[PDB]
Amino acid sequence: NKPGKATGKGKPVNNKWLNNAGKDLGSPVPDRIANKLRDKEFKSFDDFRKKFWEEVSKDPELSKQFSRNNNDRMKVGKAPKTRTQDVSGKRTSFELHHEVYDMDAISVVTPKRHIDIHRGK
């Protein structure tokens, strides 16, 4: 809701970036993605989120990790759909968890895990 610039380094990820989105704090912001968003202004986190996912769709190493239907979603700024086993009610797409626009404190998690995180689980 409040503007600001994106900061952070992120981390290198393998060809299975979101395999742990449903565990612990999920997956980190890929370093390559952080390089594209670093120092950019965003009117709101939601804005950061759209931009984040659009960047993902443009990174060859990450996009290939998603199906055609999920890449199309990311291309328009929407988070990819999670597997059915990871949804939670109407929350059916990956979410961003804060540990601001500090990419080093932001992670990607499934809805089910995100709920548990905020409940101490």
Partner 1 sequence: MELKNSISDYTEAEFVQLLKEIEKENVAATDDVLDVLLEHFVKITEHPDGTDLIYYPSDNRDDSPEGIVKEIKEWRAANGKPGFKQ
Contact residues toward partner 1 (CB under 8 A) are 54, 57-58, 63, 67-73, 75-78, 80-81, 83-84, 90, 92-93
Residue 35, contacted partner among Zn ion, partner 1, none, CB below 5-8 A by kind: none
Complex with partner 1: residue 93 or 104, whichever CB lies closer: 93
Residue 9, contacted partner among partner 1, Zn ion, none, CB below 5-8 A by kind: none
Residue with tokens 């952070």: 8
Q: Using CA atoms, how far apart are residues 120 and 30, in angstroms rounded to an integer?
A: 25
Q: What phi and psi values does residue 63 have, to the nearest 5 degrees?
A: -50, -40
Among the candidate windows 30-38, 47-55, 75-83, 96-104, which touches Zn ion by CB under 5 A? Answer: 96-104
Terminus-to-terminus CA distance in the chain, angstroms?
A: 28
Q: Using CA atoms, how far apart are residues 104 and 112, in angstroms rounded to an integer?
A: 22
Structure tokens at 109: 């998690």
Cβ at position 49, least distance to Zn ion in Å = 13
91 binds Zn ion (CB under 5 A): no
38 binds Zn ion (CB under 5 A): no
- Strand partners for 98: 106
Residue with tokens 């989105």: 21
Binding residues for Zn(2+): 97, 114, 118
Binding residues: 97, 114, 118
